[PDB]
Amino acid sequence: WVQPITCQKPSLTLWLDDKMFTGLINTGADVTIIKLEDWPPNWPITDTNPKQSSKYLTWRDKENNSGLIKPFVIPNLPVNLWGRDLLSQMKIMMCSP
Amino acid sequence: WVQPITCQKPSLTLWLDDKMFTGLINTGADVTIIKLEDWPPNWPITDTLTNLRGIGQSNNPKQSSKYLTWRDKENNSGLIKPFVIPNLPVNLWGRDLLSQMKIMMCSP
């Protein structure tokens, strides 16, 4: 797939351990941040300062590529933030004409 | 040019008016942020109440009073009006700038 960077929100939708999450492609962060309000409460979290998933989560995209991330879980943010931990596993390249 | 997304910092070096800046490609923000320590002090700023709390910044950032001409090393250029914020580790190139560079994200 291709996505131009525009003023619009650059979004990915994908699964983490078989639940769907949408969020903002966030090249400026090393790690992924999931909103606490979106966090399945049966899924265990631990402090580190911010909370983090206790378990690694399997991410899967709609083309069935997959891998592992261990996101931070943070209250009071507008959107999930896909970090380079995830983007680097999807082999995403930035290109200019 | 091509730049894969890796664990490493995705960086661009470019000019704003007559000065070179390096910073982090920051697709999560719609505005560009310059660290105050890198801000030429002769360049005028305006205090704002622009809420950037949502992109993990302040609710009262300074902003460049003027538009700045950005130019890359291939001599593409355009205009942005970045925020100027103390005590950040790196300059943050937002989609205001990235969208003027015609940057596409691609997957194999």
PDB file of C-alpha atoms in Angstrom:
ATOM      1  CA  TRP A   1       0.000   0.000   0.000  1.00  0.00           C
ATOM      2  CA  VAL A   2       0.772   3.773  -0.391  1.00  0.00           C
ATOM      3  CA  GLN A   3      -0.271   6.738   1.795  1.00  0.00           C
ATOM      4  CA  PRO A   4       0.785  10.325   1.022  1.00  0.00           C
ATOM      5  CA  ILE A   5       1.595  12.501   4.055  1.00  0.00           C
ATOM      6  CA  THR A   6      -1.047  15.299   3.935  1.00  0.00           C
ATOM      7  CA  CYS A   7      -2.536  17.599   6.540  1.00  0.00           C
ATOM      8  CA  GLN A   8      -4.912  14.644   7.152  1.00  0.00           C
ATOM      9  CA  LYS A   9      -4.318  12.163  10.059  1.00  0.00           C
ATOM     10  CA  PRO A  10      -2.018   9.329   8.778  1.00  0.00           C
ATOM     11  CA  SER A  11      -3.852   6.250  10.063  1.00  0.00           C
ATOM     12  CA  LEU A  12      -3.368   2.490  10.287  1.00  0.00           C
ATOM     13  CA  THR A  13      -6.037  -0.024  11.386  1.00  0.00           C
ATOM     14  CA  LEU A  14      -4.825  -3.418  12.582  1.00  0.00           C
ATOM     15  CA  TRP A  15      -5.187  -6.135  15.277  1.00  0.00           C
ATOM     16  CA  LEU A  16      -3.302  -6.553  18.528  1.00  0.00           C
ATOM     17  CA  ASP A  17      -3.975 -10.077  19.954  1.00  0.00           C
ATOM     18  CA  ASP A  18      -7.119 -10.398  17.787  1.00  0.00           C
ATOM     19  CA  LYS A  19      -8.734  -7.031  18.753  1.00  0.00           C
ATOM     20  CA  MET A  20      -8.903  -4.198  16.158  1.00  0.00           C
ATOM     21  CA  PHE A  21      -7.211  -0.817  16.920  1.00  0.00           C
ATOM     22  CA  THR A  22      -6.985   2.295  14.740  1.00  0.00           C
ATOM     23  CA  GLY A  23      -4.396   4.962  15.313  1.00  0.00           C
ATOM     24  CA  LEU A  24      -2.002   7.585  14.082  1.00  0.00           C
ATOM     25  CA  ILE A  25       1.288   6.680  12.366  1.00  0.00           C
ATOM     26  CA  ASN A  26       3.783   8.292  14.806  1.00  0.00           C
ATOM     27  CA  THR A  27       7.297   8.254  13.300  1.00  0.00           C
ATOM     28  CA  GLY A  28       8.638  10.453  16.135  1.00  0.00           C
ATOM     29  CA  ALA A  29       8.286   7.745  18.855  1.00  0.00           C
ATOM     30  CA  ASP A  30      10.299   4.514  19.415  1.00  0.00           C
ATOM     31  CA  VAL A  31       7.350   2.758  21.152  1.00  0.00           C
ATOM     32  CA  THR A  32       3.606   2.414  20.476  1.00  0.00           C
ATOM     33  CA  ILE A  33       1.059   4.096  22.833  1.00  0.00           C
ATOM     34  CA  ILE A  34      -2.455   2.673  23.272  1.00  0.00           C
ATOM     35  CA  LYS A  35      -5.088   4.840  25.013  1.00  0.00           C
ATOM     36  CA  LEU A  36      -5.999   3.361  28.465  1.00  0.00           C
ATOM     37  CA  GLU A  37      -9.694   3.991  27.540  1.00  0.00           C
ATOM     38  CA  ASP A  38      -9.170   1.545  24.536  1.00  0.00           C
ATOM     39  CA  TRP A  39      -7.182  -0.986  26.576  1.00  0.00           C
ATOM     40  CA  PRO A  40      -9.052  -4.312  27.206  1.00  0.00           C
ATOM     41  CA  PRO A  41      -9.200  -4.356  31.038  1.00  0.00           C
ATOM     42  CA  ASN A  42      -8.579  -8.161  31.254  1.00  0.00           C
ATOM     43  CA  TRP A  43      -5.165  -7.511  29.519  1.00  0.00           C
ATOM     44  CA  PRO A  44      -2.463  -7.069  32.222  1.00  0.00           C
ATOM     45  CA  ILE A  45      -0.379  -3.803  32.507  1.00  0.00           C
ATOM     46  CA  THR A  46       2.634  -2.861  34.766  1.00  0.00           C
ATOM     47  CA  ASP A  47       4.317   0.478  35.698  1.00  0.00           C
ATOM     48  CA  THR A  48       7.823   1.414  34.337  1.00  0.00           C
ATOM     49  CA  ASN A  49       6.218   6.940  34.719  1.00  0.00           C
ATOM     50  CA  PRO A  50       3.738   5.296  32.303  1.00  0.00           C
ATOM     51  CA  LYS A  51       1.998   1.854  32.373  1.00  0.00           C
ATOM     52  CA  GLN A  52       3.039  -0.789  29.796  1.00  0.00           C
ATOM     53  CA  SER A  53       1.476  -4.041  28.517  1.00  0.00           C
ATOM     54  CA  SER A  54       2.841  -6.871  30.751  1.00  0.00           C
ATOM     55  CA  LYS A  55       2.694  -9.247  27.733  1.00  0.00           C
ATOM     56  CA  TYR A  56       3.956  -8.851  24.187  1.00  0.00           C
ATOM     57  CA  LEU A  57       1.038  -8.458  21.750  1.00  0.00           C
ATOM     58  CA  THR A  58       0.863 -10.020  18.287  1.00  0.00           C
ATOM     59  CA  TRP A  59       0.079  -7.302  15.752  1.00  0.00           C
ATOM     60  CA  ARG A  60      -1.481  -8.380  12.432  1.00  0.00           C
ATOM     61  CA  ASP A  61      -2.334  -6.150   9.447  1.00  0.00           C
ATOM     62  CA  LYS A  62      -5.095  -6.798   6.872  1.00  0.00           C
ATOM     63  CA  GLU A  63      -2.500  -8.529   4.646  1.00  0.00           C
ATOM     64  CA  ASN A  64      -1.779 -10.959   7.522  1.00  0.00           C
ATOM     65  CA  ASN A  65       1.823  -9.706   8.115  1.00  0.00           C
ATOM     66  CA  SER A  66       2.467 -10.006  11.881  1.00  0.00           C
ATOM     67  CA  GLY A  67       5.043  -9.484  14.594  1.00  0.00           C
ATOM     68  CA  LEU A  68       5.289  -8.441  18.278  1.00  0.00           C
ATOM     69  CA  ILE A  69       5.188  -5.082  20.144  1.00  0.00           C
ATOM     70  CA  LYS A  70       4.905  -4.137  23.815  1.00  0.00           C
ATOM     71  CA  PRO A  71       3.043  -0.817  23.867  1.00  0.00           C
ATOM     72  CA  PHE A  72       2.666   1.784  26.641  1.00  0.00           C
ATOM     73  CA  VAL A  73      -0.897   2.360  27.941  1.00  0.00           C
ATOM     74  CA  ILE A  74      -1.639   6.010  28.806  1.00  0.00           C
ATOM     75  CA  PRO A  75      -4.847   7.902  29.793  1.00  0.00           C
ATOM     76  CA  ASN A  76      -6.143  11.271  28.412  1.00  0.00           C
ATOM     77  CA  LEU A  77      -4.722  11.182  24.773  1.00  0.00           C
ATOM     78  CA  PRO A  78      -6.911  11.612  21.678  1.00  0.00           C
ATOM     79  CA  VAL A  79      -5.588   8.625  19.615  1.00  0.00           C
ATOM     80  CA  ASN A  80      -3.512   5.434  19.585  1.00  0.00           C
ATOM     81  CA  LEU A  81       0.054   6.205  18.334  1.00  0.00           C
ATOM     82  CA  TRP A  82       1.850   3.603  16.192  1.00  0.00           C
ATOM     83  CA  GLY A  83       5.608   3.995  16.915  1.00  0.00           C
ATOM     84  CA  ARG A  84       8.649   2.831  14.973  1.00  0.00           C
ATOM     85  CA  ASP A  85       8.563  -0.513  16.978  1.00  0.00           C
ATOM     86  CA  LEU A  86       5.557  -1.391  14.813  1.00  0.00           C
ATOM     87  CA  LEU A  87       6.338   0.671  11.653  1.00  0.00           C
ATOM     88  CA  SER A  88       9.883  -0.865  11.332  1.00  0.00           C
ATOM     89  CA  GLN A  89       8.352  -4.407  11.450  1.00  0.00           C
ATOM     90  CA  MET A  90       5.992  -3.429   8.515  1.00  0.00           C
ATOM     91  CA  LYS A  91       9.038  -2.555   6.296  1.00  0.00           C
ATOM     92  CA  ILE A  92       7.575   0.980   5.710  1.00  0.00           C
ATOM     93  CA  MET A  93       9.735   3.340   3.529  1.00  0.00           C
ATOM     94  CA  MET A  94       9.335   7.131   3.228  1.00  0.00           C
ATOM     95  CA  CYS A  95       9.861   8.335  -0.413  1.00  0.00           C
ATOM     96  CA  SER A  96       9.798  11.690  -2.259  1.00  0.00           C
ATOM     97  CA  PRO A  97       9.153  12.251  -6.020  1.00  0.00           C
TER      98      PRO A  97
ATOM     99  CA  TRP B   1      15.477  10.035  -1.834  1.00  0.00           C
ATOM    100  CA  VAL B   2      14.455   6.964   0.290  1.00  0.00           C
ATOM    101  CA  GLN B   3      14.465   6.449   4.080  1.00  0.00           C
ATOM    102  CA  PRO B   4      13.215   3.184   5.650  1.00  0.00           C
ATOM    103  CA  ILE B   5      11.500   3.462   9.065  1.00  0.00           C
ATOM    104  CA  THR B   6      13.838   1.654  11.539  1.00  0.00           C
ATOM    105  CA  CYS B   7      14.380   1.760  15.290  1.00  0.00           C
ATOM    106  CA  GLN B   8      16.802   4.615  14.435  1.00  0.00           C
ATOM    107  CA  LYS B   9      15.674   8.327  14.558  1.00  0.00           C
ATOM    108  CA  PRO B  10      14.157   9.283  11.136  1.00  0.00           C
ATOM    109  CA  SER B  11      15.859  12.648  10.541  1.00  0.00           C
ATOM    110  CA  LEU B  12      15.835  15.441   7.917  1.00  0.00           C
ATOM    111  CA  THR B  13      18.347  18.265   7.592  1.00  0.00           C
ATOM    112  CA  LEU B  14      17.114  21.454   5.891  1.00  0.00           C
ATOM    113  CA  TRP B  15      17.139  25.299   5.990  1.00  0.00           C
ATOM    114  CA  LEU B  16      14.561  27.660   7.441  1.00  0.00           C
ATOM    115  CA  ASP B  17      15.311  31.149   6.100  1.00  0.00           C
ATOM    116  CA  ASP B  18      19.082  31.279   6.203  1.00  0.00           C
ATOM    117  CA  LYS B  19      19.793  28.635   8.935  1.00  0.00           C
ATOM    118  CA  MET B  20      20.284  24.837   8.773  1.00  0.00           C
ATOM    119  CA  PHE B  21      18.185  22.693  11.221  1.00  0.00           C
ATOM    120  CA  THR B  22      18.214  18.939  11.777  1.00  0.00           C
ATOM    121  CA  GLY B  23      15.237  17.185  13.297  1.00  0.00           C
ATOM    122  CA  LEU B  24      12.955  14.198  13.647  1.00  0.00           C
ATOM    123  CA  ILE B  25      10.313  13.333  11.025  1.00  0.00           C
ATOM    124  CA  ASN B  26       7.124  13.555  13.191  1.00  0.00           C
ATOM    125  CA  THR B  27       4.067  12.288  11.249  1.00  0.00           C
ATOM    126  CA  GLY B  28       1.986  12.433  14.497  1.00  0.00           C
ATOM    127  CA  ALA B  29       1.801  16.268  14.511  1.00  0.00           C
ATOM    128  CA  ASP B  30       0.211  18.689  12.000  1.00  0.00           C
ATOM    129  CA  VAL B  31       2.620  21.501  13.124  1.00  0.00           C
ATOM    130  CA  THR B  32       6.433  21.755  13.198  1.00  0.00           C
ATOM    131  CA  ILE B  33       8.240  22.494  16.513  1.00  0.00           C
ATOM    132  CA  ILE B  34      11.712  24.029  16.835  1.00  0.00           C
ATOM    133  CA  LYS B  35      13.589  23.637  20.141  1.00  0.00           C
ATOM    134  CA  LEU B  36      13.900  27.169  21.663  1.00  0.00           C
ATOM    135  CA  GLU B  37      17.701  26.754  22.171  1.00  0.00           C
ATOM    136  CA  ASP B  38      18.040  26.411  18.304  1.00  0.00           C
ATOM    137  CA  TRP B  39      15.803  29.427  17.625  1.00  0.00           C
ATOM    138  CA  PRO B  40      17.778  32.428  16.219  1.00  0.00           C
ATOM    139  CA  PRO B  41      17.005  35.033  18.913  1.00  0.00           C
ATOM    140  CA  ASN B  42      16.698  37.930  16.373  1.00  0.00           C
ATOM    141  CA  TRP B  43      13.763  35.995  14.763  1.00  0.00           C
ATOM    142  CA  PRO B  44      10.452  37.330  16.213  1.00  0.00           C
ATOM    143  CA  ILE B  45       7.978  35.099  18.145  1.00  0.00           C
ATOM    144  CA  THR B  46       4.359  35.554  19.344  1.00  0.00           C
ATOM    145  CA  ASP B  47       2.992  33.978  22.519  1.00  0.00           C
ATOM    146  CA  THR B  48      -0.024  31.723  21.706  1.00  0.00           C
ATOM    147  CA  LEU B  49      -2.643  29.760  23.614  1.00  0.00           C
ATOM    148  CA  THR B  50      -2.431  27.046  20.899  1.00  0.00           C
ATOM    149  CA  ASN B  51      -3.375  23.755  22.651  1.00  0.00           C
ATOM    150  CA  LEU B  52      -0.759  21.133  21.585  1.00  0.00           C
ATOM    151  CA  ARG B  53      -1.436  18.981  24.740  1.00  0.00           C
ATOM    152  CA  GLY B  54      -2.970  16.313  22.338  1.00  0.00           C
ATOM    153  CA  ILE B  55       0.392  15.883  20.406  1.00  0.00           C
ATOM    154  CA  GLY B  56       2.090  15.765  23.895  1.00  0.00           C
ATOM    155  CA  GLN B  57       3.251  19.443  24.095  1.00  0.00           C
ATOM    156  CA  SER B  58       2.182  22.734  25.881  1.00  0.00           C
ATOM    157  CA  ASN B  59      -1.116  24.718  25.877  1.00  0.00           C
ATOM    158  CA  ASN B  60       0.870  28.066  25.564  1.00  0.00           C
ATOM    159  CA  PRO B  61       3.685  27.549  23.016  1.00  0.00           C
ATOM    160  CA  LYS B  62       5.519  30.496  21.323  1.00  0.00           C
ATOM    161  CA  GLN B  63       5.162  30.569  17.535  1.00  0.00           C
ATOM    162  CA  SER B  64       7.278  32.189  14.801  1.00  0.00           C
ATOM    163  CA  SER B  65       5.681  35.625  14.083  1.00  0.00           C
ATOM    164  CA  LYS B  66       6.634  35.234  10.388  1.00  0.00           C
ATOM    165  CA  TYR B  67       6.399  32.437   7.873  1.00  0.00           C
ATOM    166  CA  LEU B  68       9.839  30.898   7.269  1.00  0.00           C
ATOM    167  CA  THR B  69      11.032  29.654   3.861  1.00  0.00           C
ATOM    168  CA  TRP B  70      12.078  26.008   4.190  1.00  0.00           C
ATOM    169  CA  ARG B  71      14.505  24.636   1.549  1.00  0.00           C
ATOM    170  CA  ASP B  72      15.849  21.081   1.229  1.00  0.00           C
ATOM    171  CA  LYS B  73      19.221  20.101  -0.352  1.00  0.00           C
ATOM    172  CA  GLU B  74      17.458  19.527  -3.706  1.00  0.00           C
ATOM    173  CA  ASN B  75      16.235  23.171  -3.542  1.00  0.00           C
ATOM    174  CA  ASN B  76      12.509  22.360  -3.141  1.00  0.00           C
ATOM    175  CA  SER B  77      11.025  25.082  -0.914  1.00  0.00           C
ATOM    176  CA  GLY B  78       7.829  26.286   0.736  1.00  0.00           C
ATOM    177  CA  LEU B  79       6.558  28.117   3.855  1.00  0.00           C
ATOM    178  CA  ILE B  80       5.813  26.959   7.441  1.00  0.00           C
ATOM    179  CA  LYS B  81       5.186  28.790  10.720  1.00  0.00           C
ATOM    180  CA  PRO B  82       6.654  26.553  13.409  1.00  0.00           C
ATOM    181  CA  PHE B  83       6.094  26.591  17.207  1.00  0.00           C
ATOM    182  CA  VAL B  84       9.184  27.275  19.369  1.00  0.00           C
ATOM    183  CA  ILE B  85       9.275  25.286  22.609  1.00  0.00           C
ATOM    184  CA  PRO B  86      11.923  25.072  25.375  1.00  0.00           C
ATOM    185  CA  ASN B  87      13.580  21.916  26.718  1.00  0.00           C
ATOM    186  CA  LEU B  88      12.713  19.419  23.891  1.00  0.00           C
ATOM    187  CA  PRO B  89      15.494  17.068  22.848  1.00  0.00           C
ATOM    188  CA  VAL B  90      15.016  17.481  19.030  1.00  0.00           C
ATOM    189  CA  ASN B  91      13.320  19.622  16.392  1.00  0.00           C
ATOM    190  CA  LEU B  92      10.072  17.918  15.185  1.00  0.00           C
ATOM    191  CA  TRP B  93       9.112  18.134  11.505  1.00  0.00           C
ATOM    192  CA  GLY B  94       5.268  18.013  11.371  1.00  0.00           C
ATOM    193  CA  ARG B  95       2.941  17.252   8.448  1.00  0.00           C
ATOM    194  CA  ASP B  96       2.714  21.083   7.674  1.00  0.00           C
ATOM    195  CA  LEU B  97       6.276  20.613   6.325  1.00  0.00           C
ATOM    196  CA  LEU B  98       6.175  16.869   5.323  1.00  0.00           C
ATOM    197  CA  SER B  99       3.003  17.445   3.146  1.00  0.00           C
ATOM    198  CA  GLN B 100       4.855  20.222   1.175  1.00  0.00           C
ATOM    199  CA  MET B 101       7.745  17.721   0.477  1.00  0.00           C
ATOM    200  CA  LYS B 102       5.313  15.297  -1.274  1.00  0.00           C
ATOM    201  CA  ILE B 103       6.442  12.480   1.115  1.00  0.00           C
ATOM    202  CA  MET B 104       4.688   9.073   0.538  1.00  0.00           C
ATOM    203  CA  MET B 105       4.870   6.136   2.991  1.00  0.00           C
ATOM    204  CA  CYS B 106       5.185   2.743   1.140  1.00  0.00           C
ATOM    205  CA  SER B 107       5.185  -0.980   2.083  1.00  0.00           C
ATOM    206  CA  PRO B 108       6.644  -3.889   0.001  1.00  0.00           C
TER     207      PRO B 108
END
